Symmetry: C3
Subunit: 337 residues, 3 copies
């Protein structure tokens, strides 16, 4: 909500309170509260006729653990300049540029966006130390054609190997048409960290992705294909040498507020490393269908429910790596502002 707008400077203080509960089932049902709150700020200042300054901060607060044991997280923290057809530049903790391509299918009710995209994993999600140049309409020449060019410095110490990265870059472009179709494509290439390279599997972490979406006439549909190389962490902290990823989603928005959704997520690992209990070879890392619904009361209140049909089978890989194969269900109630 906009809580300040004076002298050319605006502040939007936004957030949500999410009451949520999640069940897991297959061999005995169990369930947990997963409630949280999130707050953030978007600031904007008019500097001159061609320049605007901006900042964003976003902060997660767990409320499912006891007081004294709840984690907090700064999800985003960046500042930038934007100059019309010249583009924009921002720096700090932000989304990776190749995540532009994942945004279309990362629209599920409870899950989604968890195949080849991870928090603090190169530029596949939110991440530290990214400098990002963007341009919204190709220098004023092509309405609806936008792109991003991003640099990330090494984050190679005082964090888990699974979350490390070396220096690298990512890029993405999106062409949005008036009829509601949008196409995206993007790329990521980085050096690995010294601690990662000691696994002997190579010196670079790389990825490419494509997506298509239709968003009009109360219908939403999207598909995404991607591949990653030495980038996607496994549950036992190995990196997959290669992945092949596909996602799809279809939703319909009724005028009275109901919004049903069916989504599909698959991440197939290729030639995964041998390890205790697993002789090596291909294995699925992530494979599920989500069926669910929202009911939107208004822009400030919603409820939702979802079920995950987990398509992974108990096998040598899932046992060795520690991958969950059980189905899940969730419900929630959200106030937002």
């Amino acid at each position: 909500a906009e809580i300040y707008n004076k002298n050319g400077n605006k502040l939007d203080f936004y957030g949500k309170m999410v009451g949520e509960h999640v069940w897991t089932t297959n061999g005995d049902t169990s369930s947990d509260d997963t409630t949280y709150a999130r707050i953030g700020l978007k600031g904007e200042t008019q500097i001159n006729d061609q320049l605007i300054g901006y900042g964003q901060w976003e902060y997660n607060m767990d409320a499912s653990n006891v007081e004294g044991s709840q984690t907090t997280k700064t999800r985003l923290a960046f500042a930038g300049l934007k100059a019309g057809e010249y583009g924009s530049f921002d720096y700090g903790r932000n989304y990776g540029a190749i995540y532009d391509v994942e945004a279309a299918t990362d629209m599920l009710v409870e899950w989604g966006g968890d195949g080849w995209n991870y928090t603090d994993n190169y530029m596949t999600g939110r991440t530290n130390g990214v400098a990002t140049y963007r341009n919204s309409d190709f220098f004023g020449l092509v309405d609806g054609l936008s792109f991003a060019l991003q640099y990330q410095g090494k984050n190679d110490h005082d964090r888990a190997i699974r979350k490390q990265n070396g220096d690298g870059f990512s890029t993405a472009a999106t062409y949005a048409f008036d009829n509601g179709i949008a196409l995206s494509a993007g790329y990521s290439s980085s050096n690995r960290s010294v601690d990662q390279k000691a696994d002997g599997n190579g010196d670079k972490a790389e990825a490419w992705a494509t997506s298509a979406k239709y968003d009009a006439n109360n219908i939403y549909a999207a598909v995404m294909y991607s591949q990653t190389y030495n980038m996607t962490p496994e549950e036992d902290n190995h990196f997959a040498g290669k992945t092949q990823n596909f996602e799809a989603v279809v939703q319909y928005q009724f005028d009275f507020g109901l919004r049903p959704s069916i989504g599909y997520v698959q991440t197939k690992g290729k030639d995964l490393q041998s390890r205790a209990g697993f002789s090596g070879g291909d294995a699925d890392l992530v494979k599920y269908i989500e069926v669910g619904t929202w009911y939107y009361f208004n822009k400030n209140m919603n409820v939702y429910a979802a079920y995950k049909f987990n398509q992974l089978d108990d096998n040598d890989y899932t046992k060795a790596a520690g991958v969950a194969t059980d189905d899940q269900a969730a419900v929630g109630i959200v106030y937002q502002f």
Copy 2:
């Protein structure tokens, strides 16, 4: 303070900065800073003629420890719907319903509310994973008669035994009269967790409570009686098989802002378990008098002072369980908004 009210949606951003210091005395005086800040949000949205949506978040920040060692706590995080005479429903981190009955005597200057009520202890205080139905005037039929019905899921893993609970429910009713008298009563019954039941003391945690208050004509007076069963944690993490609890408070509000208070809190443990250094039997868990005062400058600023006459004597139980027997004193200065 209300910082947004537009298009049917309101936001109250509230909080306080509390400069506070606490002394302990009996065998040598010692003292500590106990300063903190607290912030929160209450949101409300008008959905249609009969439906309002709402959310609340509240967040504690210690400021008495050094930077880098200060704990933070999400005290409340929930969202809900309310529909006039049909009642309200909310879910998340919230107060237990039986705490309705404790609210009348939990009004002391510095202490209070710490006999049979604990944070993260079934539904005796703030707690995880509560679904709460409320109704304010008995379906429109009885002005001043309200009630609460609450369900809590199991919180049985990845937390201390003292803070665990199994699935259960609590309820409370309050009848508030025009003359300033209000009467409350309530109940709580839950399964214990598997880790708790291994103490051999039984499968259920239960409680009942009653209270009466007078709040008018510048006078405040209240009394509370309750009993709990396998619910109240001791200082060495045993659970009391049975407690008998009594609290009382009397205050007077002068027009110029002074508000003196005398309060009494007792929690008597019945047939407490034998353990190193303690042959078993009854013992007081909590027993003190608080004498203190506020001076309210206005609704945004106050100061206060209080003394705790700790009536516990050093005995086998207090030594064995680690219960403090010393007197205490406190002063504070509060800005609030």
Copy 3:
């Protein structure tokens, strides 16, 4: 930004998002993201004709670490009363009074204020448990002459020895002239903690400081001299018996927004204790030049860059104590509100 001002009560919700990166160089260059966000509140209430109440809270959120590993810090949390010519009183977590004297030279781009001033170190910076009386114009008699008198309680347990203190006091005065010159002087004297006194080096921690500044006509210049005794922590947690400290800074503000700066910081330790690898004697603790610049777009947006010429040489002391001798560089982009 002022987000509430009604019924005599105001609230300023302020903060910044700081995208920042820091390099170190001498033997191989390395670099790290150092992004963070900061928020805070200043509250004020008009109580009567002669009394105002106030509160301040300020909160730091690291955004350079991964989610799940980012530290947060309550920098300030206090409440107070002010009564015109009678002065003001506040209590909580606040700046030490002798820091008044350091404020003039603690104006560098990236570094500064890190010679004899430390967070949680008696009253040399922000610290716990300070009661502070201030008066702004010597009881209405001398415009521009202000002073502070501060008491701090012992913080002697459950924290590192380096951050401990016993009971003590500090004071400062500032005489600000219409021509842009200001002179400050101040003093600090405290008992040490029991755990500190066991080092055998004495029972008191003491300091004195003086400063002068010129701030007018687009020019800023300042100098500071101070000495501390059993107060300044070394990098290996010894306390220096005596320090001799000098700082200087010169800046120029161009109308179009550029603000160059050159600053100097030195802290010389006298008769430092013998220890593994170091036979004892004098040594520099801190000695560097900073050259840098801001570009202020407006009051809501700036960028900056700085270089630290680290004048410390690798010797027995720097090796033994673990003191960094390498040069550093930084850049940043800030949105503020």
